Amino acid sequence: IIHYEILEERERGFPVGNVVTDLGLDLGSLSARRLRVVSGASRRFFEVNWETGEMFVNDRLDREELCGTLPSCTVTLELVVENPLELFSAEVVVQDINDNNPSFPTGEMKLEISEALAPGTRFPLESAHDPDVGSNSLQTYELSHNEYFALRVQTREDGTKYAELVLERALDWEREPSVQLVLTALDGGTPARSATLPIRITVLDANDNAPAFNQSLYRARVREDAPPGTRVAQVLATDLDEGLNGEIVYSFGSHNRAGVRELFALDLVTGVLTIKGRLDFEDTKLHEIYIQAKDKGANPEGAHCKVLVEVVD
Amino acid sequence: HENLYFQGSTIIHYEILEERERGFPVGNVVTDLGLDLGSLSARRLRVVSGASRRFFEVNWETGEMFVNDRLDREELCGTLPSCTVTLELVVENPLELFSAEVVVQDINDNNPSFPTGEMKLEISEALAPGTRFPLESAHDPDVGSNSLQTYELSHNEYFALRVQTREDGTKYAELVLERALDWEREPSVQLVLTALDGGTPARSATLPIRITVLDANDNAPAFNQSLYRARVREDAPPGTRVAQVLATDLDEGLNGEIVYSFGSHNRAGVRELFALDLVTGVLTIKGRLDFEDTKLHEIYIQAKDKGANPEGAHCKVLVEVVD
Numbered sequence: 001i002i003h004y005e006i007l008e009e010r011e012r013g014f015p016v017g018n019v020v021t022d023l024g025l026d027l028g029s030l031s032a033r034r035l036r037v038v039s040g041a042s043r044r045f046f047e048v049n050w051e052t053g054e055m056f057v058n059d060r061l062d063r064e065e066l067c068g069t070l071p072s073c074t075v076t077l078e079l080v081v082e083n084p085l086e087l088f089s090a091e092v093v094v095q096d097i098n099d100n101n102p103s104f105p106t107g108e109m110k111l112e113i114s115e116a117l118a119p120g121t122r123f124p125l126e127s128a129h130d131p132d133v134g135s136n137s138l139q140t141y142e143l144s145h146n147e148y149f150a151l152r153v154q155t156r157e158d159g160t161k162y163a164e165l166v167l168e169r170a171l172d173w174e175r176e177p178s179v180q181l182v183l184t185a186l187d188g189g190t191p192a193r194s195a196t197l198p199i200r201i202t203v204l205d206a207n208d209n210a211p212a213f214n215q216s217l218y219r220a221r222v223r224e225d226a227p228p229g230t231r232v233a234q235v236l237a238t239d240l241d242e243g244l245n246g247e248i249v250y251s252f253g254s255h256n257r258a259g260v261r262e263l264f265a266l267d268l269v270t271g272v273l274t275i276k277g278r279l280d281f282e283d284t285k286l287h288e289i290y291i292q293a294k295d296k297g298a299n300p301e302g303a304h305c306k307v308l309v310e311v312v313d
Numbered sequence: 314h315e316n317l318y319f320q321g322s323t324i325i326h327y328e329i330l331e332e333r334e335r336g337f338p339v340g341n342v343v344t345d346l347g348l349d350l351g352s353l354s355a356r357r358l359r360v361v362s363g364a365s366r367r368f369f370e371v372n373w374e375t376g377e378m379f380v381n382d383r384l385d386r387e388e389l390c391g392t393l394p395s396c397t398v399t400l401e402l403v404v405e406n407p408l409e410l411f412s413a414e415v416v417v418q419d420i421n422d423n424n425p426s427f428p429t430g431e432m433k434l435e436i437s438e439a440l441a442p443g444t445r446f447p448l449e450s451a452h453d454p455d456v457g458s459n460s461l462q463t464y465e466l467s468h469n470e471y472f473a474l475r476v477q478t479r480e481d482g483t484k485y486a487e488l489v490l491e492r493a494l495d496w497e498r499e500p501s502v503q504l505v506l507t508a509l510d511g512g513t514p515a516r517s518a519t520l521p522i523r524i525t526v527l528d529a530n531d532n533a534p535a536f537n538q539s540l541y542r543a544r545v546r547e548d549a550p551p552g553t554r555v556a557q558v559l560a561t562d563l564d565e566g567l568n569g570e571i572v573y574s575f576g577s578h579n580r581a582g583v584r585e586l587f588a589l590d591l592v593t594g595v596l597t598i599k600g601r602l603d604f605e606d607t608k609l610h611e612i613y614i615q616a617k618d619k620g621a622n623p624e625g626a627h628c629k630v631l632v633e634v635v636d
């Protein structure tokens with residue numbers, strides 16, 4: 001058994017070794033002994049030169065195709081001569097070169113993340129793969145500079161690596177509903193090869209804002225003979241959240257006396273306060289009506305205002 | 314009349330607890346008005362009857378004013394800090410009207426209550442400690458110390474309780490995740506939130522909180538053994554069973570469902586010579602073995618789950634070809 005080692009991906013014609021020098025054959029006899037490479041059903045990776053005795057690269061030796069992520073890659077063959085018939089075995093170690101970049105399986109990663117997630121939350125990212133071996137395989141990841149996430153690179157027990165985002169500062173949908181990052185995967189080649197993966201973070205609104213009335217106090221004057229349906233006031237609150245979280249419902253507050261709901265009506269959607277019953281100047285000249293605004297989100301915080309309805313003779 | 318008023322208010326001013334029984338004596342308006350009990354009967358003393366309920370009546374003979382209907386401060390005045398019922402008294406001969414007023418004082422006749430009989434949260438075991446979860450608010454319609462004061466949470470190993478006070482003085486509780494959940498160990502957690510007022514004793518309401526822990530893919534497959542050995546006759550035909558490899562995964566559903574494949578850790582030709590069932594882990598002969606060509610095949614097999622960020626497990630099958 002003769003042993004050679006070459007880099008993968010050598011050009012056709014690249015010299016591997018010499019049968020005169022290594023197998024002790026006589027150069028003048030090669031044609032007569034019909035020296036040949038035996039390849040079997042495998043590819044004709046190697047051929048021999050009768051004029052020089054040199055064995056050489058005759059087809060593409062791609063270590064990734066041949067041996068995947070095996071730490072070592074060996075191609076075997078035989079040489080046969082006749083007169084007399086002899087078979088010689090040789091093995092060629094095919095050494096890795098850094099001819100591949102890392103790559104991510106997708107062109108981008110999209111994430112949806114609630115602004116309500118506490119710092120400390122971790123999010124594993126899409127892994128990169130590099131088909132080379134040893135130092136030429138994936139080494140680490142880097143993350144673009146940003147205001148929210150730190151990067152941790154974790155090594156699994158089988159030696160493979162993935163990146164994790166670690167939320168360091170809370171997201172804020174009101175301030176920045178979209179965050180763009182770039183994850184770079186690097187191999188450990190010299191020079192290093194890399195790939196990038198854009199990460200598109202969509203921040204999801206949470207109900208972290210209470211309604212707020214445009215004013216705390218509304219004042220109205222209404223003739224005591226005003227008929228049912230008479231518009232008294234329209235209150236208005238706004239909410240910074242989106243959707244249900246920002247959608248406001250008006251109601252009578254708990255800070256009201258019995259009677260308010262029979263004397264007044266309130267549109268829960270429009271905040272319009274109307275006369276429902278009959279006012280009476282001599283009975284009550286001033287009504288104090290507390291109104292609450294709540295959103296349709298989780299854990300709604302109430303906003304409150306007061307409407308002072310002055311009854312006019 | 315010489316003294317019907319003090320600092321702008323009627324002197325016919327009484328203060329009683331809410332929810333007194335009918336007939337409960339409030340005061341004597343004749344003694345306080347200084348009316349002549351002598352000719353009282355001629356004056357037909359009575360409470361003026363308006364549209365509102367007759368909460369009080371007066372004995373026209375004695376002047377005694379008493380509770381005549383239920384006085385529920387919660388209905389009357391909601392969460393207003395003070396509750397005054399006003400009324401008028403009339404006498405004839407001559408006709409006169411007097412204002413009167415009765416302060417209705419709160420008693421702690423209500424528990425807090427929750428708007429639902431239960432609450433559910435679904436929480437991933439992958440959520441970080443420090444995460445907070447708002448819980449349903451309780452309401453107590455009494456006032457002052459008789460209204461909602463605090464919340465307590467059942468003893469548990471994962472969550473602390475915080476009680477927050479909003480700008481309007483209402484209070485809610487939130488769970489705070491203090492120790493990570495773990496689906497593999499406890500896939501659900503049951504808690505009880507108690508709302509308490511500040512009465513003596515404190516009145517309370519409870520809210521069952523049922524937490525479903527959501528599984529995360531935080532376990533890699535693990536092979537039963539790292540190395541499998543087989544001896545196969547070189548004339549073994551296609552379909553010949555070589556080995557069955559087996560990995561297990563502690564996670565739930567897809568996160569724990571295992572797929573077997575040939576590892577990247579293999580030489581070209583492994584897929585042509587062998588076959589591997591991706592579900593059962595059964596390795597079979599596919600091509601033709603040849604003892605003179607190759608005496609020993611090293612096959613690496615990978616197990617990966619169907620969850621997020623799968624971590625592969627690996628094993629090796631040594632197939633010895635028998636002449």
Ligand SMILES: [Ca+2]
Pocket residue numbers: 008009061062063064065099
């Ligand atoms: Ca290559």
Ligand SMILES: [Ca+2]
Pocket residue numbers: 008063064096097098099100131132133136
């Ligand atoms: Ca390579």
Ligand SMILES: [Ca+2]
Pocket residue numbers: 098099100101102130131132136137138187189193
């Ligand atoms: Ca590489």
Ligand SMILES: [Ca+2]
Pocket residue numbers: 115171172173174175208
């Ligand atoms: Ca926000």
Ligand SMILES: [Ca+2]
Pocket residue numbers: 173174205206207208209240241242245
């Ligand atoms: Ca928000």
Ligand SMILES: [Ca+2]
Pocket residue numbers: 207208209210211239240241245246295297
């Ligand atoms: Ca809101």
Ligand SMILES: [Ca+2]
Pocket residue numbers: 224280281282
């Ligand atoms: Ca009038």
Ligand SMILES: [Ca+2]
Pocket residue numbers: 280281282283
């Ligand atoms: Ca009138």
Ligand SMILES: [Ca+2]
Pocket residue numbers: 224281312313
């Ligand atoms: Ca009038």
Ligand SMILES: [Ca+2]
Pocket residue numbers: 331332384385386387388422
């Ligand atoms: Ca009551």
Ligand SMILES: [Ca+2]
Pocket residue numbers: 421422423424425453454455459460461510512516
């Ligand atoms: Ca109470």
Ligand SMILES: [Ca+2]
Pocket residue numbers: 331386387419420421422423454455456459
């Ligand atoms: Ca009460």
Ligand SMILES: [Ca+2]
Pocket residue numbers: 438494495496497498531
């Ligand atoms: Ca777990």
Ligand SMILES: [Ca+2]
Pocket residue numbers: 438496497528529530531532563564565568
């Ligand atoms: Ca799990």
Ligand SMILES: [Ca+2]
Pocket residue numbers: 530531532533534562563564568569618620
């Ligand atoms: Ca798993």
Ligand SMILES: [Cl-]
Pocket residue numbers: 012013
């Ligand atoms: Cl050439």
